[PDB]
Subunit: 250 residues, 4 copies
Amino acid sequence: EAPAAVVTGAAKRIGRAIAVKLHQTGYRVVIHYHNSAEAAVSLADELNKERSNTAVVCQADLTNSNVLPASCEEIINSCFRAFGRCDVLVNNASAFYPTPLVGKTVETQVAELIGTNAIAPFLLTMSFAQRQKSNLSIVNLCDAMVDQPCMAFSLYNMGKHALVGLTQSAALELAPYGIRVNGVAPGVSLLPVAMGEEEKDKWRRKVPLGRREASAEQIADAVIFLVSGSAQYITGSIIKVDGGLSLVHA
Amino acid sequence: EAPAAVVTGAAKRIGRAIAVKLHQTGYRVVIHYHNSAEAAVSLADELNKERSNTAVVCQADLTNSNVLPASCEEIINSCFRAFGRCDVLVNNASAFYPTPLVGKTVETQVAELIGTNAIAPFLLTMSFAQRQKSSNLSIVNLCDAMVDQPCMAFSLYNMGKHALVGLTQSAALELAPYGIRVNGVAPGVSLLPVAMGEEEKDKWRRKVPLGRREASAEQIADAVIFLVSGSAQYITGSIIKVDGGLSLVHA
Amino acid sequence: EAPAAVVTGAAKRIGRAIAVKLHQTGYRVVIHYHNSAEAAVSLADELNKERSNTAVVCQADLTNSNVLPASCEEIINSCFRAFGRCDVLVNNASAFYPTPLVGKTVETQVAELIGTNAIAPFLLTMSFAQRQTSSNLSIVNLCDAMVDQPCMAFSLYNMGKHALVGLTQSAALELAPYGIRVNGVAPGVSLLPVAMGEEEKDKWRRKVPLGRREASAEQIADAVIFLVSGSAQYITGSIIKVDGGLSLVHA
Amino acid sequence: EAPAAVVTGAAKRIGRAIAVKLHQTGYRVVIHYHNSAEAAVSLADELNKERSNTAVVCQADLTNSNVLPASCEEIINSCFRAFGRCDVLVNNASAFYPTPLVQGKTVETQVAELIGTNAIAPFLLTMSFAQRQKSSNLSIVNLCDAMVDQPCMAFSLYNMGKHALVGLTQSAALELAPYGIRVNGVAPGVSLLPVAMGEEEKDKWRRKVPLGRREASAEQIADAVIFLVSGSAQYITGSIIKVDGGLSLVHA
Ligand SMILES: NC(=O)c1ccc[n+]([C@@H]2O[C@H](COP(=O)([O-])OP(=O)(O)OC[C@H]3O[C@@H](n4cnc5c(N)ncnc54)[C@H](OP(=O)(O)O)[C@@H]3O)[C@@H](O)[C@H]2O)c1
Ligand SMILES: NC(=O)c1ccc[n+]([C@@H]2O[C@H](COP(=O)([O-])OP(=O)(O)OC[C@H]3O[C@@H](n4cnc5c(N)ncnc54)[C@H](OP(=O)(O)O)[C@@H]3O)[C@@H](O)[C@H]2O)c1
Ligand SMILES: NC(=O)c1ccc[n+]([C@@H]2O[C@H](COP(=O)([O-])OP(=O)(O)OC[C@H]3O[C@@H](n4cnc5c(N)ncnc54)[C@H](OP(=O)(O)O)[C@@H]3O)[C@@H](O)[C@H]2O)c1
Ligand SMILES: NC(=O)c1ccc[n+]([C@@H]2O[C@H](COP(=O)([O-])OP(=O)(O)OC[C@H]3O[C@@H](n4cnc5c(N)ncnc54)[C@H](OP(=O)(O)O)[C@@H]3O)[C@@H](O)[C@H]2O)c1
Ligand SMILES: Nc1nc(N2CCSCC2)c2cc[nH]c2n1
Ligand SMILES: Nc1nc(N2CCSCC2)c2cc[nH]c2n1
Ligand SMILES: Nc1nc(N2CCSCC2)c2cc[nH]c2n1
Ligand SMILES: Nc1nc(N2CCSCC2)c2cc[nH]c2n1
Ligand SMILES: Nc1nc(N2CCSCC2)c2cc[nH]c2n1
Ligand SMILES: Nc1nc(N2CCSCC2)c2cc[nH]c2n1
Ligand SMILES: Nc1nc(N2CCSCC2)c2cc[nH]c2n1
Ligand SMILES: Nc1nc(N2CCSCC2)c2cc[nH]c2n1
């Protein structure tokens, strides 16, 4: 019978492309979402049309708070309830906005940016590992530019840095259970509607390999590799999918 | 006129040695503490005996909470009330204990470990810089040389230190326009717990290529002094390992 | 037409497994060898028995010398000669032995360790690029996961693998405009040879968090295959560890 | 008795600044040079004028060849001959020029010069330095490059050389730690620019640096060297200190 995967922030964009490829590969998927309820439901419908009873949605705010552990336990619980198993966790959900050092409160920004990008991944990893009853693995969506951070994005960058540490820490600690933990680190990918042709072009032009952004599917391809039987000896690795962007000096 | 430094968790061990060396170098010091009031005050008294009116203490919990930003603002404000200036911020205070993946709730652990190691440093950096909006202004973060060879069951602590690395780098870039340098010192094995069995202390000591011993607090403090000095005025965004080669040792 | 690949040091062990997988995926292949001519030829016989005229062999010493550039050009030429195209280059050939700091001369060791691990890959890279719509051109360098926790007495080997990292990154940048991707695969402990003592083999195996075993040659090859595939077409400058977590383990 | 130091490529620019600062701290110095004989002799003159019998010059090509090991052994031997000891080695000499991957010197000469100076000579010097040893504070400092993981276009061999030197720094730190010899590095970003560089190209480099939009002075680089050799760095080994004013942290 078919393995099962949770993908956080899977309603749209990169998380959706990850959910789609996992499903094409034969996974049953939990499509987690926060605000994008319509897109989530529509994706589950599309996927269930392809193979019945292979997709469910699961709503949760991944902002840090005293109930985040419960929410994260519930996401994993929702995979077992629907599919009787949980083979793969993809930590993709992520808040992203500037927090300059010099109308959300600063503690709300901390809770959002650090919760989504780091604490929730940690709690989800905890619950995933504890619920284990095979090719089990976790893939974290990191950031190829983590050591060349954008100006005024401190809290975001801190979250992505903690996510690197979690990836390495959990790889080590979960290895005795046969659970692999790895990361995929995009550079410029699927820039959204709808920043100017200006700023999109400015970022696309930085990319040595083709002067273009990654497609969502290109990011998903690397996730697919890491969860596959072709990556069974791979744990604690973070694969840049950045067309060489992080190698480019000032 | 004499520059001033805030050192967090400065009552004991490594932070104390940092505050002593800064004081010996000519700084006035805010000795921040959480639970260690008696040692904090004892340090302040010793330093004030050396030079009157050069050391004050400041108490705060640096666990993450709704009140942390105001607590951090108060710490910076306190250096300005005492000394009229704040030249140097040393983020040293840190909670440290295991949080295995498989008394305290996990969200408390998050609050303490990510609060002390990362969020408090960030809020302190904001407040420090906001107050600055021949001066040699800088921040030094106490990191961890073993951050990419993490210890078993220390994921939250490790996550905290990794975030601290990101902060060190992001703030270096963002504050460079104000002449504020931001750097780190990354100990390997330094001061071991008093209560740790000497036999267990020795398993750690034996891992260190250089001398098969832990770093003194003073050796950690030496790197901090360098980073804040006029000899490091082009250095920002750098994290100096002070680890006796430990991080280079394979399994 | 079927794409073609050059694999250096392909007669045995990891290079053989890479050659076989590329061939299984539909590539024609040049099996480069230095001393292992019998094994290179049995490999080509096997592969050509599956699909005719799809494997050839090519001999060369990859030690640095006055003739190395010409040898490297000839390797790439052998692929164009045999197959009309060269889509993939896998730099796998590598000399490996200790060079303590305190009967080959030291300069012969420099030539072999740095030649095979760094200089020949640079020259092969030059010749590969010089010879070049819907193509998928890439280079994969066999690096080393333990490059920043190097083994005692292996400075020149380690220097060579460090230089290969540099090449991987420099070449990814410089060849990107040509559509040529350049990536690395970094084993930890893989296919420990028959020669080595079993207690020393067991020591290395026991260090590996994921299964306390070495990687098979096929496991290393899987990562190579991924990197040369259409599934990695936005990936350049990346080095993928295939090490079962070994590099993450502290002293 | 005063300690002694070898500084490679020390006749001018950063290497000079290092030798001068070491000398001011109380070291006797061997000023190595290759082609800049006049500048080297002029430096030794000044230092000797400050304290008699405290500087000597030593000529050597550090291009890789089968006699490079002898040449490096002789550099260390010259420090012992002049001063009776050798406490500090600074590996500063370096060839630097592009070597484009797609199309003067043959490529094998370019390999020998770029990889020789930046990596192999440091290795051989380190071997000889350790081999010649018996409150000592023995150390090696390697001049690295903060941009090593964001390399400049068409500088493959140079970058390979600097990467190899990182590996040496790390490997030698571990292997020489038992002898009390620390090995560390200093990694400039943009420091002293070429005389001939057009001030427009110079300003393009300057404007990249977050801390001050200016290049590091030679003294700023030397300051980090001096820290690493001092008693204030006695637990530090295997460490590479960027002196780059934030440049390596700046994205494309
Ligand atoms: N795009 C890039 O160029 C790029 C570059 C580097 C790294 N990455 C990383 O790659 C991953 C995917 O990137 P992306 O651009 O597709 O991400 P994105 O669109 O910015 O966000 C992905 C999803 O995260 C979810 N999310 C945000 N805040 C949340 C919260 N408080 N609780 C729960 N979920 C929340 C949202 O769900 P709802 O829509 O359901 O609210 C959102 O759709 C991210 O981890 C990102 O940081 C992307
Ligand atoms: N010792 C080592 O081997 C080692 C190794 C690697 C890195 N480091 C780093 O170097 C630094 C110094 O190490 P250390 O061993 O001296 O540190 P430590 O003794 O564990 O902690 C230093 C101080 O942190 C303060 N602290 C802890 N929790 C706090 C909270 N919730 N709010 C406010 N302050 C709090 C405490 O102050 P009170 O006592 O006043 O409560 C404590 O004395 C730390 O950042 C540490 O992570 C140390
Ligand atoms: N095995 C591991 O645990 C491990 C760990 C980390 C990294 N790696 C890397 O992964 C790659 C494959 O490892 P491996 O253990 O399979 O390699 P290996 O057996 O040591 O050597 C591979 C081949 O390299 C060729 N070679 C050696 N010296 C040469 C020279 N002077 N000129 C031309 N060719 C020469 C040999 O070809 P002939 O037999 O034809 O002479 C040899 O069969 C290497 O790059 C290695 O550094 C391996
Ligand atoms: N300048 C920068 O912005 C910068 C940036 C990053 C890193 N660095 C590093 O910092 C160090 C000093 O930089 P720099 O600009 O002062 O260096 P440099 O002037 O390019 O070179 C220093 C010396 O190296 C010696 N040298 C060159 N080729 C040689 C050979 N074949 N044999 C022996 N010696 C040779 C030369 O000695 P003679 O003049 O006597 O012939 C030269 O004076 C270098 O290791 C460099 O890579 C500098
Ligand atoms: N969560 C998230 N979204 C991102 N987006 C969506 C908002 S606009 C630009 C791409 C990026 C980009 C780099 N890291 C990111 N992380
Ligand atoms: N990897 C990445 N890309 C970024 N870009 C390009 C993708 S879309 C928005 C700006 C930013 C911005 C802040 N941190 C970032 N990290
Ligand atoms: N640098 C470092 N040292 C550690 N040691 C040695 C010092 S005292 C306690 C254990 C630990 C433990 C978890 N993370 C650590 N990081
Ligand atoms: N905050 C903190 N405390 C530490 N302690 C606890 C008090 S005494 C033994 C060291 C260590 C050790 C490595 N990283 C650490 N971080
Ligand atoms: N070229 C090469 N061969 C290796 N071999 C063959 C000889 S014995 C150990 C496996 C190893 C091992 C780590 N890096 C290596 N590189
Ligand atoms: N990755 C790796 N493995 C090594 N091992 C384990 C494989 S077989 C021989 C020792 C060594 C030895 C020196 N450099 C090495 N690098
Ligand atoms: N040996 C060396 N020389 C350099 N010089 C002197 C010649 S022209 C360019 C500046 C630079 C510059 C960056 N890394 C360098 N390494
Ligand atoms: N650190 C650094 N600076 C560079 N610059 C700035 C200083 S002067 C010459 C160009 C170059 C050039 C090639 N590799 C370099 N590395």
